[PDB]
Amino acid sequence: MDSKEDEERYQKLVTENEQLQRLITQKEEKIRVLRQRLVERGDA
Amino acid sequence: GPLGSSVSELEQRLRDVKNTNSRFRKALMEKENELQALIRKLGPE
């Protein structure tokens, strides 16, 4: 029909893009601190 | 791709963000592997 059909798909996907980036960062952030907590004990 | 109905400008950004989301959904599951990996390193003393 029109671009709207795919644009409605688009806007949903960009919406997941927002959350995905959020979590990747949150996980990566956790990963960062999580290393530091173990290393200074496990390896020192 | 967009030869009609949907404008090229929309679908090209759509292809981009889909490749983006698929990649990000991959990375996200991977980062969980790094997450547990570290916890497996929390396993010892």
b/e for A4-23, b at 16 or more Cβ within 10 A? eebbebbeebeeebeebeee
Closest CA in chain B for residue A9: B14
Taking alpha carbons only, the member of B43, B11, B20 closest to residue A24 is B20
- Torsional class of B5: left (φ above 0), alpha (ψ -120 to 50), beta (otherwise): left
Instruction: Supply B41's token pair.
Output: 């390193």
Helix ranges restricted to H, chain A: 3-42
B28 touches chain A (CB under 8 A): yes
Instruction: Supply B36's token pair.
Output: 């547990």
- Residue A41: its chain B contacts at CB < 8 A? 45
Residue ranges per structural domain of chain B = 1-45
Q: Taken in order A11, B24, B26, B43, is the CA torsion positive or negative?
A: negative
Q: Give the method used.
A: NMR
Asked if A24 and B27 count as a contact pair (C-beta separation under 8 A), the reply is yes
